[PDB]
Every structure is written in structure tokens, then in C-alpha cells.
Design a protein around this nucleic acid. Structure first.
Ligand SMILES: [Mg+2]
Ligand SMILES: [Mg+2]
Ligand SMILES: [Mg+2]
Ligand SMILES: [Mg+2]
Ligand SMILES: [Mg+2]
Ligand SMILES: [Mg+2]
Ligand SMILES: [Mg+2]
Ligand SMILES: [Mg+2]
Ligand SMILES: [Mg+2]
Ligand SMILES: [Mg+2]
Ligand SMILES: [Mg+2]
Ligand SMILES: [Mg+2]
Ligand SMILES: [Mg+2]
Ligand SMILES: [Mg+2]
Ligand SMILES: [Mg+2]
Ligand SMILES: [Mg+2]
Lengths: 123, 205, 151, 80, 82, 129, 156
RNA sequence: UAGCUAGUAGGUGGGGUAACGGCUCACCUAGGCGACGAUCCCUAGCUGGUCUGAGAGGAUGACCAGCCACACUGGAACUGA
RNA sequence: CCCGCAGAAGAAGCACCGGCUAACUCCGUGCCAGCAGCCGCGGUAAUACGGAGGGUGCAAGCGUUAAUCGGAAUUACUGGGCGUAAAGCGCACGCAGGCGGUUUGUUAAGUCAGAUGUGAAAUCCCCGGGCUCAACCUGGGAACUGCAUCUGAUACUGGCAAG
């Protein structure tokens, strides 16, 4: 790695392969679920993971975790998706937004409702 | 854009006086100044250096009333100047118009003084001004507009100012309710509880 | 072959049947991940939440009567736009839609083609590939999917 | 005072013109190591009077061909 | 042609004029040749709003530059200003 | 192949002061002498001397203050593999001016301080400390 | 009139025939705020002991650095056990801009204005193993003058 | 992506142009380019700057200013400074 | 912009409180679920899920995602490595290339110094000025690290000559 080697070959740098390819820098994308399904983990861990196969406007079909506590989705349900990766899910790099575009407004939540679209309940 | 909750909770949180009430009474008479607010406010937590830094920043903010974003502006400008940054930071913090009025004892609490500025009661160098964050220059002469020179609050605050230490850099005349910002106050001219070096350290994270 | 998929079918069919739900395809994949995928058919509709209901009940009957001793992973699924058809009856229900299929044999001239169903028989399914009404034995088909196209 | 360059011919296979190669010693932009770079040219060799290697001296002129824009002005060594 | 005119600067409802010279074909705030002063309509005696390097101007109009009537007035002022 | 005499000369001091020798010597050269002379009067050594004619050798009396060599860190900056030149204003400072940077100028070889006194850039040869 | 500061505490294991036996290693520095400082590190069965004994060794080993005015006298780096630490004096009132581990070391010594940065691994014991050495390797404007046999301005 | 090029490289003459010029043509010469990356391929308007960074750099060229390019697609010219 | 009027009268929210990371308990809660930037969390009690109280931060905003740099010395010119962690070609010869002992002369290319031209304006920066402050606008300067040219300097490197 001497200078005379740099002049004959400058230092390179590998590109930043986007962990969220199906977004193409779009902060969100609209999509239609082409399948709905849940998956339990191995014998030791018992849990249910909500997730949909969804075709995007760009043409990609991906997997997006269903935020949970709102489940009104089925084949041909449009939905807006954002790039969020949950641990314990192998291919889920996207989270369905909760609170817009054909997603049920979750039942009343007194805390952190904005992250679910629940409006401030007017007592 | 101004904090409007209870006052003493801050002092009880920052564990010291902040001159948030007129001062006719002692703090303990009005609160548990020795103990933090809230259910768990009695127990003494094991904080961190970072916690120290934050807690000192929130102090000087709260003792002056600058919100966050407006504050670091003062800092980000204070660092740009010459001399000891954290030093001159306080210096310009001592330059806020309201604070000067408060220092001049026209207002018991700074908020009370701030309300005066906001309520168009003070003229710097003969001309009216109503922005509280209006910086001031040496030799400037603030004053009271006659529409308020007869206000009950201004005379009572003047009767409360001499109960506290007469500032040096700025000189007042309570006779006609107008004073002179002669000199830019120095670091020593302020208190000593303030640790400006850690205030810089915080934003320098 | 069939990893005693017969028992898998009965074990899943019972709770699913109890749910008033119809069962369509059972598939298990070992090695890559011992995960089982189930295709269900609810006429009213199939939300994920219901898939959770059946996932719990089937998990329950699966737990006691499971002697395969593979890793315990299995997902519940509802037919995708591209949905596999396993029964002759399934071919019958999709009278006139495109279905892709691949022959089990990898010999040359294998039926790796898609067609549109014209007629449905038990052993033989008529699908139109290259303008020809071909008939296929479903047992000799490795895997087949219907209408991968979204309209 | 006219400007001029002092290169060194590398070819004269063409009628009354030559291919001078200049040599500029330049420091690398980033790596700081000095380097030598050449700039070939197409100089009008009036009279066809330069061999190979013979270091010459040129001068910039109006275009004379698709390529040439340089006139020879002298020879400072004749190709030993 | 080559003229001496006013490019508009400052902000909305608070305009500021840089008196420059430029080919007339160029936009009011496009390129120019030699900024030769400024104009401030809203000076109000707070600060000078008319500084001119009229000799440089004189040099320009001397060699065929023409004058916007506004600055033509402005020039008249500084002469009256003396 | 010894493609640098100066670096060698320096290491001969570093590996010299380290080995705690009383004195070290090199095949001399009109340059090294100039290199020595400046640091010599700069207290970093006691004295040098050169003898011999066909193969003159330079010989240096190393220094130690308190069981510790006076000079302790030596590094040739402008090296054959990569040269270095600095203008007047950008003349470096060694250990905030406690160290010394030996630079050659058209006016010869001297410390960095003397250079920015005369206001002459040049080629930075070594940092001494 | 000293000044102390814990740095880090780890729970280390030790596997015995039956299971293991945890322990606790403390790590701390002690300085006089006047360019004189040492550090200590000692294991124990439980935290206060470790924090106590390690605190005491640091009362020895207190080297005396020749800083000037809460700041160093020249940039300086120090590399120990795979950890590299660059430091350099800073302007007046700049403060102590340094990673966590170093900040205390700089603090208790008496430094007020210093830039700093670590490199490589950031194991706390290593960087202080790598910092105090860097500190003592400073040189007064007369330590040179002495060792160079000159007057102060003769170098300055 | 290793060879590339025959108006190609050069000269002579004529034509042509507001102007120099394979600009064009005749003619002659057989060159010219390339590892200091020719050729090919993908991508892209460029810059002042902008964001970041302690710095060196990295990123970027929205707004504003300079320059270029284009005006359904393709081609051609006319008029005219 | 000013003056007058009435009346506290018309005007506060959003995240978060296991650690990182400032800020904690109660009750459900049952590994059902749900939470999640990572590490992780959940049982008969969970300061990590839900509600509640309390608290922290920020504020006409507050969070999430995206994108870029930074942190990253993680392409290491500044500023990394290669015995075993990834990394010395199986070995050799050798062209191009890179690099080169020592003395003198010469050259002035590199190099350095100086001058001169240029490096648009805006922008950034310093000192001002003006909008009541600020943002904003503006004077002047600095700077634009560049390039070219001229005149010098000769230690260094190169060229030439002679050793
Ligand atoms: Mg605001
Ligand atoms: Mg905490
Ligand atoms: Mg001709
Ligand atoms: Mg002719
Ligand atoms: Mg960096
Ligand atoms: Mg635009
Ligand atoms: Mg015409
Ligand atoms: Mg980097
Ligand atoms: Mg490495
Ligand atoms: Mg090998
Ligand atoms: Mg060999
Ligand atoms: Mg050579
Ligand atoms: Mg040599
Ligand atoms: Mg400019
Ligand atoms: Mg002003
Ligand atoms: Mg020579």
C-alpha cells in the first residue's frame, strides 16, 4: 500500500447497498397486499407475527410486518408501507403504517397514539 | 412559546434557588426546596456526568427562561465570538432586555419583567421595544413609558430590588424609573454556582 | 414424497373444520427452515387475526400429536393472488384462469408451462399451452401456481 | 516576449510535420508524490527538418490542420 | 447596447438597487459588467442610499454607455448633493 | 540497495541513542555535515567531526541528559519515495515549536525557525525531538 | 484535597468445579487537580471493596505531569495494548472534549482545555494504560531548554 | 470494454466559410490514436456553490447567478446583425 | 406603523421514563399477547407489554420513515494493515515503470521568494449599517488556498558535463 501503488490504483469504497431497496429513497410507498398470513417461531418461542405479501406501485412484491392491534386487511387491501426492520423476522425490512390508507384506526390508545394514527380522544 | 407550569417544581428539580418568585418569602416556606418533585421525588437518584451537564443547562435556561432552540443559538453564536465562549455566553444572556429590566429591579420576577417588555412598557434609548430577547448595548438607557410609570407592580418591584445586591455593570435611577447599561457585565460580576465549561461541553457532544 | 402429510392434513383439518373454515393446501418445507405453510379458504374473507386463531388451535393439536420431531415452525396463510391448486376440485373451481405448472421429471420435454384451464378431470387437467388443449396428471406435477398475474 | 515550449519529437512519418511529446513534472493532487506527465502534440515541421528524439522548441499558432496548432521554432539538439 | 440601470435586490417590500452596467439584452438581475454603486429608496437618512462612482460612469457613458432615466435622476442628485 | 543516506543517518542515531552508544559515525557527505551542524548548535548533540579523504566518515558524539537521550524521536519526512516541500507561511511546527524541523532552502539548511525568519520555504527533511 | 472518579466496573467470572464464582473489578483514577495523577484497578468479590482497594493503589503511582494552565504544552499521542489516544492543547475555555474514559483522567489531573480522541479498541483500562504515559511524555519549555542546554527563548 | 481509425493522419491544389481548418474535393504520402486507458459500455447537463466534516475529504448541483443543451418526434433550410 | 376600546379575557401540544439515554411506581397483563434502533423484554409482580399516577425532553409544533455526511482510523493522503484473525504470488528472470552512493561545474526544470494579471456577483468570514429584535437586507474588507506571466534564489531533486 505504498503511494506509488495508490497512484496506479486509487483506494476504492464499496457502495451502500440500501437495506430498503423497494423504496428507492421514497419515505413511503403505496402497495396492495397480495397475501395475508401469520407465522409462529420455533418450539421454544411462542408468538404470532402478522405480515403481508404486498405488490408495490414500483412493481415489487415484499413482506411488511402488520403493526398489530389493527388487523382488517385481506387480499386487495391497499396499504402504505415504510422501511422498518423488526428483529426475529428474516425478510421483513418494512412496517405497514398504522393510521392511513386502508388500515384500521386502532382501538383507543391513551399513549403514543400518533404512532398509530389514533386521534386525541375528546372527552 | 414559554414555560407556564408551576415554578418551584423546577427549583425543586434543579435543587436550588432560581429567583422564580418575588422573594418576599423564603423558598422552603413555599415548597420542599430540598427535595425533587413527584412521587419518587423524595429519593435521591444516582445520576451521571451527562446528567450533570443536562441539569446545569436546564438550570441556566430556566433561570433565564430561554427555550431550547433559541438557547443553542445563543451558544452557537457565543462560541463564534472571541474570548472564553461559555463566559461570553452568559454575558449575552445577561444582555436580554427583560433580564436587564429585571436586574434593574423594575420587575420582581423576570417573567413579570418580561410581561412588561411584551406589554410595551419600556423604551431603550427613547424608542419603544417589546421583544424580550432584544439584546442591549453599553451606554443604553432603558426607561418606563409613562403609560405605566404609575403601575403598582413597577414601584413594588423597585422596593424589592434593593433587598438584593445592586448590580455593578449596569446603573439605575429608581427616581424616574430608568437606568443605564454602562458596561457589559463580567464573569465575576455574575454568580459562581454556574459551571459554564460543562455547559459548553454539553453542546460540544 | 409425503412426509405423512396425510396425518398433517387430518391434524390441521380438524380444528380448521371446527372453525367453519375450509382447508386447501398443506405444504411443509424441511431443511431451509422446518416451516409449514397452510392455505385456508374463508368465503367471507381471511384477516391475519383469524389466521392467528387457527394458528393457535392447530398449534395446540400439533403439539400433542406431533411425532415427526422436526423443528416446530409453521405459518398460517391465506391464498395469495398466485394461489397453488392441489385438488382436481381446485382446478374445477378455477374454470378459466391461467395456471403455471412444472413436471416432477427434469428430463427434456418436461411440462414446465402455463395454460388456461379449459376442462377439469380427476387424473387429467386440460390447460391450453401453445394453442394445444393439453391434459396433465396432477400426481406427476412437482408444483403449480394459479394467476401469478395481478389485475 | 513570445511563449514557447520545449518538447521532444517521437515521430516524423508525416509530410513536413512532427509529433512532439512535452514532459511536465507535476505533483499528484491527493497523494502528494510528484509525477511526470507527457502531452503529445502535432507540430508543423516546416521543411521537414527534424529527426527522432532530437529535442526541439515549438510555438502556438493558428490552426493548420485538423490536429496541428504548433509551429517549430528551433532545434536544440540534433538526435545524436 | 450597453446601458447603466438598476438591478433589484433587498427583500419583499424592502427593495435595494445596485446600479450596474450591462448589455441591455440581459435580465434585470442577470449578468452585468461593472457594478458602479447602489441605490436604497428606503434609506430615510438612516444611511446613505446613493453612492455613485460617476467617474467610472463618466468613463463608460464616455465610451457610448447609455443611462436609465432613474439613475439619470440619481446622477442629477449627487451633483445637486454638491 | 541503500537508496537513501539521510534516513540511514537518522536511524543510525535513533538506533544509536537507543543502544545508548557514546558516539556514532557514518560515511560522510557534504549534506549530512550541514544536517549535523545545525542540530549540533541546536544542542541536540555535542559535536561532530569528519575525517578521511577518499571515503570521509562523519562521526557524532551523542547526548544524554539524565540517563535519557536528549534527542528521542527522529523521522525523515521528505523521503525518496515521496518528496515534500512547504511554502514560507505553511512551515510546520514540531511539538508546538519545542521540537525542530530541519529544512533545506536555496539559502542552505537551517531550522524551521530560521527559515520563517528569512521567510523561505523549502524541503522539509526531518522532524527532530 | 485529592480528587477521585470511578471509570468502569465489570463482573468477571471464574469457573470452578461446581459452576462459577463471579467477582467485581473496579477502575478509577485519582488526581490533585494540579498536573499530578494516578490510576488504580483492583478485583474483589463485590463492588465496594473493589472500588475501595483500586481507589487506594491509585493514591500511589500518582505521576506529576508538567501541564500549563489546565492545558497541555504540545500535541501528544500515546499507544498502549492496542489503544491509540491523540491529545493536543486547546484554546482557553475550550473545555475537556474527550471520550468518556479519558475525560476523568484529564479532569482529575488539572486539565481544563484539551482536545482528544481515541482510536482502535476502546477498552477503558487500555486507554488509561495508554493515556497517563502519553501525559508524562509532555515536555516543559525548560525540560527541553535544560536537556538541550539552552535558555527558554533560545527555544522560544 | 484492448486495440482503434482510410477523410482515417499528413501534404499539394481547388472549392467552401465572416473567419483558421479534411470544412469539402481532387491528388499524393501512409499514417493517427492507445496501458499517461485508446476504443467500447453504463451513468450524468457543468460551475460558482450547497450539506456534512476539526481537518483533509465525502456528498451534491433543488432555489439564486454564469454556461450549455432542448422546444411533439425526425429532417431540412429561409429570412436575418 | 400609531392611538383608543373592552376584558384574563380568544390561544398547548407530542414523544419518552430497562440500558444506551434526562426521567418510576401502581393495576392489570400471562410469556396470551404485545414492545422493539440494537441489546433485549413478559409471568404469576413486568420500572421494558396495557391502563393509571408521577416524571423527563421539546414546543406551535412533536414523532416516524427516507436521504447524505459524521461517528467509521470501516479504503486509513492526512490516518490501517498482511507469522496464526481477511490479506506475501510456488519460485525466478526481466521490459515498461518507480527509486538511486559520492565530488565539482553548469543549468534553473522541479522548488522557493517576489511582482503582475486573473480567479464574476451572490454565498462563507471579519467590521459595520438598516428593518423595534431576530431571521432578513446591506457597506466595506477578508478570503477565493487557483492559474498564468515576469524577476529572482541555488540548498535540495532533476538535466548536462567532468570526476
Ligand atoms: Mg419558534
Ligand atoms: Mg438514567
Ligand atoms: Mg488549401
Ligand atoms: Mg483557396
Ligand atoms: Mg473525520
Ligand atoms: Mg429548481
Ligand atoms: Mg441571410
Ligand atoms: Mg473515513
Ligand atoms: Mg485493520
Ligand atoms: Mg502463499
Ligand atoms: Mg530478481
Ligand atoms: Mg531517474
Ligand atoms: Mg543522487
Ligand atoms: Mg466571488
Ligand atoms: Mg443593528
Ligand atoms: Mg545536480
Amino acid at each position: 500500500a505504498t503511494v506509488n501503488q495508490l497512484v496506479r490504483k486509487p483506494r476504492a469504497r464499496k457502495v451502500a447497498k440500501s437495506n430498503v431497496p423497494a423504496l428507492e429513497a421514497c419515505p413511503q410507498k403505496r402497495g396492495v397486499c397480495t397475501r395475508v398470513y401469520t407465522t409462529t417461531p420455533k418450539k421454544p418461542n411462542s408468538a404470532l407475527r402478522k405480515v403481508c405479501r404486498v405488490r408495490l406501485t414500483n412493481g415489487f412484491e415484499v413482506t411488511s410486518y402488520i403493526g398489530g392491534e389493527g388487523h382488517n386487511l385481506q387480499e386487495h387491501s391497499v396499504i402504505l408501507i415504510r422501511g422498518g426492520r423488526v428483529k426475529d423476522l428474516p425478510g421483513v425490512r418494512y412496517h405497514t403504517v398504522r393510521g392511513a390508507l386502508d388500515c384500521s384506526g386502532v382501538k383507543d390508545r391513551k399513549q403514543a397514539r400518533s404512532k398509530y394514527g389514533v386521534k386525541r380522544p375528546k372527552a | 412559546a414559554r414555560y407556564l407550569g408551576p415554578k418551584l417544581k423546577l427549583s425543586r428539580r434543579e435543587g436550588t434557588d432560581l429567583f422564580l418568585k418575588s422573594g418576599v418569602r423564603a423558598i422552603d416556606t413555599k415548597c420542599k426546596i430540598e427535595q425533587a418533585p413527584g412521587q419518587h421525588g423524595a429519593r435521591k437518584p444516582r445520576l451521571s456526568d451527562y446528567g450533570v451537564q443536562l441539569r446545569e443547562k436546564q438550570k441556566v435556561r430556566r433561570i433565564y427562561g430561554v427555550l431550547e432552540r433559541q438557547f443553542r443559538n445563543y451558544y452557537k453564536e457565543a462560541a463564534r465570538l472571541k474570548g472564553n465562549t461559555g463566559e461570553n455566553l452568559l454575558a449575552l444572556l445577561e444582555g436580554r432586555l427583560d433580564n436587564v429590566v429585571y436586574r434593574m429591579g423594575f420587575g420582581a420576577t423576570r417573567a413579570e419583567a418580561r410581561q412588561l417588555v411584551s406589554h410595551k412598557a419600556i423604551m431603550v434609548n427613547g424608542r419603544v421595544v417589546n421583544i424580550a430577547s432584544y439584546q442591549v448595548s453599553p451606554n443604553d438607557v432603558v426607561s418606563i413609558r409613562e403609560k405605566a410609570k404609575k403601575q403598582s407592580r413597577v414601584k413594588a418591584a423597585l422596593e424589592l430590588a434593593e433587598q438584593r445586591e445592586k448590580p455593578t455593570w449596569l446603573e439605575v435611577d429608581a427616581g424616574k424609573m430608568e437606568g443605564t447599561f454602562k458596561r457589559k457585565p463580567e464573569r465575576s460580576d455574575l454568580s459562581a454556582d454556574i459551571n459554564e465549561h460543562l455547559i459548553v461541553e454539553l453542546y460540544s457532544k | 414424497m409425503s412426509t405423512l402429510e396425510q396425518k398433517l392434513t387430518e391434524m390441521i383439518t380438524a380444528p380448521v373444520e371446527a372453525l367453519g373454515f375450509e382447508l386447501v393446501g398443506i405444504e411443509f418445507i424441511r431443511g431451509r427452515t422446518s416451516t409449514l405453510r397452510i392455505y385456508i379458504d374463508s368465503e367471507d374473507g381471511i384477516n391475519v387475526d383469524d389466521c392467528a386463531d387457527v394458528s393457535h388451535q392447530v398449534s395446540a393439536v400439533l403439539d400433542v400429536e406431533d411425532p415427526i420431531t422436526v423443528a416446530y415452525n409453521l405459518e398460517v396463510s391465506s391464498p395469495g393472488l398466485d394461489r397453488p391448486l392441489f385438488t382436481a376440485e381446485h382446478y374445477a373451481r378455477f374454470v378459466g384462469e391461467e395456471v403455471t405448472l412444472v413436471l416432477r421429471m427434469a428430463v427434456q420435454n418436461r411440462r414446465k408451462w402455463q395454460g388456461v384451464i379449459k376442462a377439469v378431470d380427476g387424473e387429467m387437467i386440460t390447460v391450453t399451452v401453445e394453442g394445444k388443449d393439453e391434459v396433465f396428471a396432477l400426481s406427476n406435477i412437482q408444483k403449480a401456481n394459479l394467476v401469478p398475474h395481478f389485475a | 516576449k513570445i511563449r514557447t515550449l520545449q518538447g521532444r519529437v517521437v515521430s516524423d512519418k508525416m509530410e513536413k510535420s512532427i509529433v512532439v511529446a512535452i514532459e511536465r513534472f507535476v505533483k499528484h493532487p491527493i497523494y502528494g508524490k510528484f509525477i511526470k506527465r507527457t502531452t503529445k502534440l502535432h507540430v508543423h515541421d516546416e521543411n521537414n527538418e527534424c529527426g527522432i528524439g532530437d529535442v526541439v522548441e515549438i510555438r502556438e499558432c493558428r490552426p493548420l490542420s485538423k490536429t496541428k496548432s504548433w509551429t517549430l521554432v528551433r532545434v536544440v539538439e540534433k538526435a545524436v | 447596447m450597453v446601458t447603466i440601470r438598476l438591478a433589484r435586490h433587498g427583500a419583499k417590500k424592502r427593495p435595494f438597487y445596485q446600479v450596474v452596467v450591462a448589455d441591455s439584452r440581459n435580465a434585470r438581475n442577470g449578468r452585468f459588467i461593472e457594478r458602479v454603486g447602489f441605490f436604497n429608496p428606503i434609506a430615510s437618512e438612516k444611511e446613505e442610499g446613493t453612492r455613485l462612482d460617476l467617474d467610472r460612469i463618466a468613463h463608460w457613458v464616455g465610451q457610448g454607455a447609455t443611462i436609465s432615466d432613474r439613475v439619470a435622476a440619481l446622477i442629477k442628485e449627487v451633483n445637486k448633493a454638491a | 540497495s541503500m537508496q537513501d543516506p539521510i534516513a540511514d543517518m537518522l536511524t543510525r542515531i535513533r538506533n544509536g541513542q537507543a543502544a545508548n552508544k557514546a558516539a556514532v559515525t557514518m560515511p560522510s557527505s557534504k549534506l549530512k555535515v550541514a544536517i549535523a551542524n545545525v542540530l549540533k548548535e541546536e544542542g541536540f548533540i555535542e559535536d561532530f567531526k569528519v575525517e578521511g579523504d577518499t571515503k570521509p566518515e562523519l562521526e557524532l558524539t551523542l547526548k544524554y541528559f539524565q540517563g535519557k537521550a536528549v534527542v528521542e524521536s527522529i523521522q525523515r519526512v521528505s523521503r525518496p519515495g515521496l518528496r515534500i516541500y512547504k511554502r514560507k507561511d505553511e512551515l510546520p511546527k514540531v511539538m508546538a515549536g519545542l521540537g525542530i524541523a530541519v529544512v533545506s532552502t536555496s539559502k542552505g539548511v537551517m531550522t524551521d525557525r530560521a527559515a520563517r525568519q528569512a521567510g523561505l520555504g523549502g524541503e522539509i527533511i526531518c522532524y527532530v525531538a | 484535597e485529592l480528587q477521585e472518579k470511578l471509570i468502569a466496573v465489570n463482573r468477571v467470572s471464574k469457573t470452578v468445579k461446581g459452576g462459577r464464582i463471579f467477582s467485581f473489578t473496579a477502575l478509577t483514577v485519582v488526581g490533585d487537580g494540579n498536573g499530578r495523577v494516578g490510576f488504580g484497578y483492583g478485583k474483589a468479590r463485590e463492588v465496594p471493596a473493589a472500588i475501595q482497594k483500586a481507589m487506594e493503589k491509585a493514591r500511589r503511582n500518582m505521576i506529576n505531569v508538567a501541564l500549563n494552565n489546565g492545558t497541555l504544552q504540545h500535541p501528544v499521542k500515546g499507544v498502549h495494548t492496542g489503544s491509540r489516544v491523540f491529545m493536543q492543547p486547546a484554546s482557553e475555555g475550550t473545555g475537556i472534549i474527550a471520550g468518556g474514559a479519558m475525560r476523568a483522567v484529564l479532569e482529575v489531573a488539572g486539565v481544563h482545555n484539551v482536545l482528544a480522541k481515541a482510536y482502535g479498541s476502546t477498552n477503558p483500562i487500555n486507554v488509561v494504560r495508554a493515556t497517563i504515559d502519553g501525559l508524562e511524555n509532555m515536555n516543559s519549555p525548560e525540560m527541553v531548554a535544560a536537556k538541550r542546554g539552552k535558555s527558554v527563548e533560545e527555544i522560544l
